C-alpha cells in the first residue's frame, strides 16, 4: 500500500543517520553544510513515533544529536549522539516483517546481514580515525586508510602495515580483534547457512534421489532398471518440483486445507465430466481423498485378475486397456477419462489390463472413499451405472 | 538459598587465583603486598573440600603455591604453583549445575566459554612475558604488548610487528599457533552455535511457516488465501509461541503429564460451568483428551449435515450458530459456552451450522472420549440432557 | 553417446575463454598469435546455440570480444569482452546434468567447486596486474607475483609483502578482502561438507553400530555378548553394506519397486526349487513379502513349542533341525532348502528345534502372506503337501 | 592377543619412516648412522605382507628407499623414496579397525587426525628446507625456522617474517597456502565435530530436558511443579544415563535382543520370587514385555476405581497401599514385591490405592501379556492364586 513507501523512507533516513553520525563525530567540520538536508529526517523520526517494544523508538526519537553538535560538547558527552542509531533494530524488525510478503525471506535476511556488517565496519573505521594523532592529511585518504585497516582486522587477514602505536590505540585494536572478528565470523557463518537454505526443496529432491541411486548402484541393478527410475525421478522433479503435497498439506488446519485442496485439484475437478457440474458438496468430500500417482511409460496400471479396489482418474496422459493376454486393444482412454468402476459396481476380479502408452499422471480414489461416496450420494452412481454397463 | 552465595564466592576466589598466579609467576615483586588479601582464599579452598570426581578438588585444595613462592624456587618447580587452577573445571561444572535453575542455560554456557578464552589469553600473555629478555620497561606497557601479541596470534590475524627472536620464543610461538588458534576457532564455533540455539522455538516456527509459504507461492495460491493463512500462522505465533503442546507433553511420564495438563488447562476447566464444580475425577479424565483447535474469522466450525462426532468447548472467542441455509441467527455462543451435544445425545446428522464471528480458540473433545465419559459418570450427562432438550 | 564429446568440447573451449580473456585484457600483446587457435571456438559458441534459461547462452554466443580487441577500445568498453564468460554457468549446469549418470555426483560437485575457485583466483590476479604502475618487468614474474598476492588475500593468510599503494589499489584490495575471502570460505565449507557426504552409507552404519556399542558398554554387557553383536554388525556391513532395503525401496513407486524387487531377489527365486519354474504371477506376489533375516552361528531360528507362524527359505547358509531335547540330529538343511510348513499345513505347535550350524542368511515369509498364497494358488500347496507329509 | 603387539609395532615403524624419509631427503648426511636401526624395519615391512586393497601394502613393501639413498640419485628420482609412506593409509585403517574394540572410537579418530596433521606439517617443513639457498647454518636452527614457517602458513596466521624469495619458493608457498591451509581447516572442523560427538548421550539428555523446561517456564508452571519435574529428569539422568532402552534395543535383531534383555533385566528376574526359579521359557517370554516406569516420591501408582490393566513388579523402591479414602495403611510393599493381580485374577475395579513412600523404579507388565502368560502356563497362575486370595 503506502505504508511500504513510509517504511522504506524510514529505512532511508536511518541508513542516513548510521552513515552520518560517526562521520560528523570524527570531522566536526560537517553538520554545518548538511544541516538543510538534516532536521527534516529528525522530524521524520519524531513523526514516526505516532505513526505506528518501542523502547528503541522513543529513545531514538529524541532530538539528542542536534544539541550535542550545537553546543560542541567534548567526547565523553559527544558519544551520546549515537542514541539515534537504536532505530536500527526497530527498522530491521519492521523491514523483515513487511518485505517478506513478496520476496524470499532468506534473501532478505542475507541482505540485512550484509548491511549490518557494512555499517559496523564503517563505524569501527570512524572510531579508529579519532584515536590517530592530528596530522595534516586529506580526509579522503585518512578515511580510506582507516577503512582498509578495519576490513583487514575484521577479516582476520592482518597484513600488518597499519598497527596501533599509542596504548589507547592498542586497547582499541585488542577490543576490535576480540569482538569484531568474532562477530564477522558468526555473520559469515549465518550468511553461508542462509545461502544453503535458499533452495531447500531442490536439496531435498537431490538428497532423496541420491540415496536411491546409491542403493541401486550398490545392488548391481541392471542399466535398463537404472533408467525408468532416474528418468522417473527427473520427471517428478520437472512436473512437481519435489514438493510432496501430502507432507506440506498436513501442517495447515482442515478449514484452510480444504481451500488449498480445491484450488490445487480444481484442474482435475473441472476436466472430469463426472466431477464437474456435480454438487459442491460431493466435490468437497472428494477433494481430499484424490491421491496422485505417477506411472511410467509402458507400465501396468491395472492387471486383469487382482481383487480390484481403486478407481483412477486420468489427469494428464494416456493409457490403453488390453485383453487378459494383450491381444485385443479395446478402447484407448485419454486425458479426462476414468477407469476402474466395474470391479466395484459389480464385485468381480479385474476385468482387463491397463497399460500406459506414455508418461501419465493419474489420480487414484481409494476403495473406502469410493464405497462411502456411492452410498451417501446416489446421483453420482447413476452416471457410473450407465457407464459401467456400456463398458 | 545460601549455597549460591558460597558457590559464587568460590567462583570469585578461583577467578582471583587464575588472574593472580601467572602475574606473580611473571613478576616476583608481587606476593608481598597481595598476601593479606591472599591466605584467606587459600583457607576458603581448604574449607570448601568438607563443605560439599573431586580429584581436582583435593589437588587444588593443597596450599602448594604458598611454599613455592616463599622458598623462591626456580622455574622447573615454580611452574607447580599452577595446580591451584585445576579448581576451574570443578567450579565451572558447579556453576553450570547450580545457576541453570533460573537463567537460560545456553546463555550461561556462552558466558562460560567467553570467560575460559579470556583466562587462557591472559595466561598465554603471561607466559610470553617470561621468555622475553630482561629490559628496563614499565610493567604495564610490557603486559599490554604481551596481551596484544597473544590476541593477535590467537585470532589468526598476525600483523607481524611482535615476532619471536630466540629459538625458545620461536618454539613457544609455534606451540601457540598450533594450539591456541585452533582452540579459539573451536570455541568461536561453539559460541556461534549457542547463539543460534538461544531461540530454537522461534526458529522452528519460522522454518515451518517458511516451508508452508514457499509451497503456497509455488502453487499460485490466490492472495485472498495467502492471507487467512499467513495471519493464522501469525496468530499461532502470538498466542502460543509456536510450542505445540502435544509434542512437548509426550516426553514427560504420565504422573507428571497429569499435573502439567491440569495446570495448563485449568483456565478452560474453571470457566466451563459444566467442567468446574464437577468431581476431581471427571476433570482428571478430561484434562488429557481436550484438544485445542484454532478457527479463523468467518470460518465454519460445524456444518449442518455431517455425521457429527466432536463436541467443542469455547475457551477464548465467539461463534454463531445459523440455520441450514444461513438465514436464522438462532443464538450467539460466547466465551465459556459449548456446542455439539445433540449430535450424540441423540443420533442425528449435524443440526445447524456454526460459524466464527471472530478469531476463536476452541477445545475439541473427541467422539470416543465423549462416549466413554457419558457412560462412566452419568451425573455429567444429566446436565447435558437438560441442555440438549432446551436446545 | 556423441553428445558427451560435444559437451566436453564446449567445456574445453569455455575454460579456454575463461583462461584467455583476462590474459589478453592485461597484455594486449596477445590476440595476434593466438588468433588462429581462436575464431574456431567462437564459431563453436555460435554453432552450439542451435545444437541444444538460455539467456547466458545467447549473450555469450555474441562475437563481442573480437570487435573489442580489434578496435583497441579503452578500458571502460574493453571490460565488455568478459561477456563470453557467462557461458560458464550454462556449461556448469550441463556438465552437472550429463556427467552424473556414471560417476558419483558429490565428487563431480567437488571438482566443479575447485575449478570455480581456481578460475576466480586467476581472474582476480589478472585484475590486480592492470592496476599496477607500468614497470619493466618480465610477464611471467609479474603474473607469478600477482597470483601469489591473490592466493594470499583469498586464503586470509596475509603475509603483507605485497600491499596496495595507490588509492585505486587500496579500493581493489578492500573489495577483494570483502568478497573473495568470504566466497572462498563458503566454497571451502561446501567442499568439506561434500567430502563428508562421499560415504553417507558407511557413516550411517558407523553411527548405528556406535550407538549400540555405547549402550552395551554402559549396561555392563558381558564380553561373550559384546562379541556375537559386534561380529553380527561387522557381517551386516560386509554382506549388505549397511543399506537396509526396506528403507530405500519405500521411496520408489510400486511399478518400479516390483522390477527392483525381482532383480534383487532373483537369486533366491531361482534357487528355491519351489519358487523357480512356478508361474510368473506367484513370484510377483512373493517378491515383495520375502523378508531377509540374519541369524548368528549356533543360534535358534525356531524352537519346538511356540505357535509357529513364519516359513523360512534358506538363501546362503546351513541350519540344523534337532529334537525337542537336542538329542536326535534329524536332517541337515542347506542352501536352497526351506523349513516351517508343518506348523501351518497342519495347525500344531512347532514340531522341532532349528539351530544354525554356521552364519546363515534366511528369507522369512510372514504368516499372513503364506495363508493368502496357499489359498489363491493351490498348485503351490500341492508341492508343499507331499513335502509336509514326508517330513 | 599378540596381533595387537604386531599392529602397534607396524605403527611404530611407519611413524619412524614418516619422520625419517623427509629428514634424510633434506640432509644426506644421515642414512649413514641410522642404518643399523634401519634395515630391520624394512624387513618388518617385507615380512608384514605375508602376515595378514593391499595395493599400498605391496607398493610400500618394496625396498625402494635403500637403493635411492645408496646410489645418491638426483632429486627427480630421489623423490621416489616417499613410496614408503603409502603404508600410512593401510596402517591408519588397521589401527582404526583393531583398537576400537576397547576405547571410544571418536577419541581414536581424534588422535588419528592430530597425528596426520602433525606428520603433514613436518613433511611440508622438510620440503621448505630444500628450496632454501645453501647457507652455513646449524641444522637444528634451520629446521626450527622451517617448522615455524610451516605452522604459520598452515594456521592462516601469516606473521610475514619468513617469506619466499625465489620464484620456486613463491610457487611452493602458493601451493602450500592453497592446499595445506584448507586441509588444516577441514581437519580442525572434523576435530571440533568429533569433540562434540564424544558425549552424544549426555547432549541428548540435555536437549530433551532443556526443551521441556523451556515449555514449562513459558506456561507459567508453578515452582512446586517445576520441582518434581527437574528432579525427576535429574534422577533419570543419574540412574539410567539418558539411554532409553526401547530406542536402542530396536536396532538389534530378535535373537540378540533376547540375550541383551535377559542380561539387563536379570536383576529383576532373580529378585522377584515369582519370576526366579520358574522355567527358562516363561522368563524368555516375560523378558521383552517388562516395561520400566519411574514414579516420583509421594505419587499415585494405582488409584482405587479405574478398570485396572497392568501389574507392577517393584525393582528398586518402596510403595504403600492405602484405603479408598487413605485412612488404613494396609501393608507396606518393598523391593522385590509385586501388586496388581486381583484386578485381573478377578474382574473388579481397582481394589485400593498405591502411593510411593519414596523414589521407586517399577516394572510394568501390560494387560495383554498378563492374559497370554496366565493362559499358556498355568503353573505361574497357581502361585498368583494363593497370593490373590490371601490379599
Ligand atoms: C566505539 C567507541 C570509540 C571509543 C573512542 C572513540 C572516540 O573517542 O572518538 C569518537 C569517534 O566516534 C565514534 O566513536 C563512533 C563509533 C560508533 C560505532 C557505531 C556502530 C554502528 C553499528 C569521537 O570523538
Ligand atoms: C605455559 C608454560 C610456559 C613455558 C615457559 C614459561 C616460563 O618459563 O615462565 C613462567 C611463566 O608463567 C607461566 O608460564 C604461566 C602459564 C600458565 C598458563 C595458565 C592458563 C590458564 C587457563 C614463569 O617463569
Ligand atoms: C567491550 C569493552 C571495552 C573496554 C575494555 C578495555 C579495558 C580498558 C583498559 C585501559 C588501560 O589499560 O589503559 C591503557 C594504558 O595502560 C597500560 O599501559 C596497560 C596496562 C594493562 C593493560 C590491560 C591489558 C589489556 C586488556 C584489554 C582487555 C580487552 C578485552 C575485553 C573485550 C591505555 O588506556
Ligand atoms: C574485476 C574488474 C577490475 C577493475 C579494474 C581492472 C582494470 O581496469 O583492468 C582490466 C583487467 O582485466 C580484468 O579486469 C579481468 C577481470 C575479470 C574477472 C573474471 C572472473 C572469472 C570467474 C583491463 O584493463
Ligand atoms: C598439486 C600441484 C602441484 C604443482 C603445480 C604448480 C605448477 C608449476 C609451475 C612452474 C613454474 O611456473 O615455474 C616457475 C617460474 O616461472 C615463472 O616465473 C611463473 C610463470 C607463471 C607461473 C604460474 C602461476 C602460478 C600458478 C600455480 C598454480 C598452483 C595451484 C595448483 C594447486 C618456477 O618453477
Ligand atoms: C562489488 C563492488 C565494487 C566497487 C565498490 C568500490 C567503491 C569505489 C570508490 C572509489 C574511490 O573512493 O576512489 C578512490 C580514491 O578516493 C579516496 O581517496 C577514498 C575516499 C573514500 C573511499 C571510500 C572508502 C572505501 C569504501 C570501499 C567499499 C567497498 C565495499 C563494497 C563491497 C580511488 O578510486
Ligand atoms: C613436496 C615436494 C617438494 C617439491 C620440491 C622439494 C625438493 O625438491 O626437495 C626434496 C625435499 O624432500 C621432500 O620434498 C619431502 C616432502 C614429502 C612430504 C610428505 C608428507 C607426509 C604426509 C629433496 O630434494
Ligand atoms: C603441548 C606441548 C609442549 C612442548 C613440546 C615442544 C617440544 C620442545 C622442543 C625443545 C627444543 O627443540 O629446543 C629448542 C632449541 O632447539 C632447536 O634449535 C630446534 C631443534 C628442533 C626443534 C623441533 C622443531 C619444533 C617442534 C615443536 C613441536 C610442537 C608441537 C606440539 C604441540 C629451544 O628449547
Ligand atoms: N469395452 C471397454 N471399453 C472401454 N473401457 C473398458 C472396456 N472394458 C473395460 N473397460 C475399462 O477398463 C477397466 C479395467 O478393468 P476394471 O475392472 O478396472 O474397469 C475397467 C473399465 O473401466
Ligand atoms: N436453538 C438453539 N439455541 C442455542 N444453541 C443451539 C440451538 N440449536 C442448536 N444449538 C447448538 O448448535 C449446535 C450445532 O449443531 P450440533 O448438532 O453440533 O449441536 C448444536 C447445539 O449445541
Ligand atoms: N524328519 C524331518 N526331516 C527333515 N525336516 C524336518 C523333519 N521334521 C521336521 N522337519 C522340518 O523342521 C521344521 C521345524 O519345525 P516346523 O514345524 O517349523 O517345520 C519343520 C519341518 O520343516
Ligand atoms: N490386604 C492387603 N495386603 C497386601 N496387599 C494388598 C491387600 N489388599 C490389596 N493389596 C494389593 O494392593 C493392590 C492394589 O489394588 P489391585 O487391585 O491393583 O491389587 C492390589 C493387591 O496387589
TrEMBL record, chains A, B, C, D:
Binding site for 3',5'-cyclic GMP: 340, 350-351
Residue intervals passing through the bilayer: 3-19, 58-86, 106-131, 143-160, 172-196
List of residues binding 3',5'-cyclic AMP 1: 340-341, 350-352
Keywords: Ion channel, Ion transport, Ligand-gated ion channel, Membrane, Nucleotide-binding, Transmembrane, Transmembrane helix, Transport
Residues reported to bind 3',5'-cyclic AMP 2: 340-341, 350-352, 391
Subcellular location: Membrane
Membrane protein topology class: Multi-pass membrane protein
A GO CC annotation given for this chain: membrane
Record: residues binding 3',5'-cyclic AMP 3: 340, 342
CDD domains attached to this UniProt entry: CAP_ED
Organism: Winmispira thermophila (strain ATCC 700085 / DSM 6578 / Z-1203) (Spirochaeta thermophila)
Protein name (database record): Transcriptional regulator, Crp/Fnr family
GO molecular function, one term: protein-containing complex binding
Amino acid at each position: 500500500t503506502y505504508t511500504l513507501v513510509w517504511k522504506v523512507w524510514i529505512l532511508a533516513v536511518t541508513l542516513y543517520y548510521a552513515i552520518r553520525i560517526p562521520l560528523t563525530l570524527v570531522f566536526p567540520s560537517l553538520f554545518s553544510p548538511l544541516l538543510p538536508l538534516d532536521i527534516l529526517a529528525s522530524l521524520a523520526l519524531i513523526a514516526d513515533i505516532p505513526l505506528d517494544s518501542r523502547l528503541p523508538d522513543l529513545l531514538a526519537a529524541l532530538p539528542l544529536d542536534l544539541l550535542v553538535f550545537a553546543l560542541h560538547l567534548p567526547s565523553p558527552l559527544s558519544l551520546l549522539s549515537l542514541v539515534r542509531l537504536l532505530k536500527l533494530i526497530s527498522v530491521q524488525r519492521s523491514a523483515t516483517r513487511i518485505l517478506s510478503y513478496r520476496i524470499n525471506p532468506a534473501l532478505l535476511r542475507l541482505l540485512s546481514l550484509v548491511g549490518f556488517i557494512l555499517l559496523a565496519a564503517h563505524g569501527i573505521a570512524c572510531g579508529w580515525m579519532s584515536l590517530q594523532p592530528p596530522s595534516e592529511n586529506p580526509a579522503g585518504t585518512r578515511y580510506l586508510s582507516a577503512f582498509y585497516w578495519t576490513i583487514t582486522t575484521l577479516t582476520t587477514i592482518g597484513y600488518g602495515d597499519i598497527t596501533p602505536s599509542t596504548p589507547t590505540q592498542t586497547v582499541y585494536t585488542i577490543v576490535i580483534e576480540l569482538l569484531g572478528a568474532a562477530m564477522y565470523g558468526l555473520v559469515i557463518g549465518n550468511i553461508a547457512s542462509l545461502v544453503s537454505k535458499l533452495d531447500a526443496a531442490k536439496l531435498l529432491h537431490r538428497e532423496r534421489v541420491e540415496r536411491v541411486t546409491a542403493f541401486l548402484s550398490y545392488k548391481r541393478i541392471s542399466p535398463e532398471l537404472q533408467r525408468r527410475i532416474i528418468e522417473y525421478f527427473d520427471y517428478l522433479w520437472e512436473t512437481r518440483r519435489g514438493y510432496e503435497e501430502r507432507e506440506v498439506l498436513k501442517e495447515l488446519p482442515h478449514p484452510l486445507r480444504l481451500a488449498v485442496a480445491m484450488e490445487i485439484h480444481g484442474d482435475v475437478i473441472e476436466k472430469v465430466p463426472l466431477f464437474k457440474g456435480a454438487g459442491e458438496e460431493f466435490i468437497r468430500d472428494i477433494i481430499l481423498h484424490l491421491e496422485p500417482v505417477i506411472y511410467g511409460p509402458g507400465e501396468y496400471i491395472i492387471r486383469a485378475g487382482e481383487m480390484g479396489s481403486d478407481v483412477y482418474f486420468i489427469n494428464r496422459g494416456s493409457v490403453e486397456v488390453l485383453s487378459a493376454d494383450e491381444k485385443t486393444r479395446y478402447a484407448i482412454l485419454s486425458e479426462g477419462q476414468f477407469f476402474g468402476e466395474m470391479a466395484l459396481i459389480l464385485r468381480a476380479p479385474r476385468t482387463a489390463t491397463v497399460r500406459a502408452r506414455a508418461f501419465c499422471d493419474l489420480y487414484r480414489l481409494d476403495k473406502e472413499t469410493f464405497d462411502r461416496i456411492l452410498s451417501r450420494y446416489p446421483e453420482i452412481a447413476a452416471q457410473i451405472q450407465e457407464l459401467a454397463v456400456r463398458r
